[PDB]
């Protein structure tokens, strides 16, 4: 079928990274650390 | 007495809720979305 797509990848390498950051720094509150990582991602390139 | 390293639970349960809305909303960029989700969660904790 030439019209049935709805599952863009990319969420894998992204989530895995969070697993290596949260485990490396081991912050007290992940909620705040979560907003810190992604928010900074907006300045990584785009 | 028997020492080792383990992982704190909650991380999987958190991304699970995020993984859901990501598909339901099907936003164009997950980066900004991820920042809008966790950042909004803080509003729940007082």
């Amino acid at each position: 079928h030439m019209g049935h797509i709805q599952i863009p990848p990319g969420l894998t390498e992204l989530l895995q990274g969070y697993t290596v950051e949260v485990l490396r720094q081991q912050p007290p509150d992940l909620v705040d650390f979560a907003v810190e990582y992604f928010t900074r991602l907006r300045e990584a390139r785009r | 007495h028997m020492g080792h390293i383990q992982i704190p639970p909650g991380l999987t349960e958190l991304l699970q809720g995020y993984t859901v809305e990501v598909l339901r909303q099907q936003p164009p960029d997950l980066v900004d979305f991820a920042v809008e989700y966790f950042t909004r969660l803080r509003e729940a904790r007082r």
Binding site: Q6, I7, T12, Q16 | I7, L15, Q16, T19, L23
Partner: peptide, 24 residues
């Protein structure tokens, strides 16, 4: 380290849905 093992399986669960949503 062990994190590379626990973080590798945790992802397998999230991708099991995002990739299985456009098929079943």
């Amino acid at each position: 380290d062990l994190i590379e093992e626990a973080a590798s399986r945790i992802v397998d669960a999230v991708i099991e849905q995002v990739k299985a949503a456009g098929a079943y």
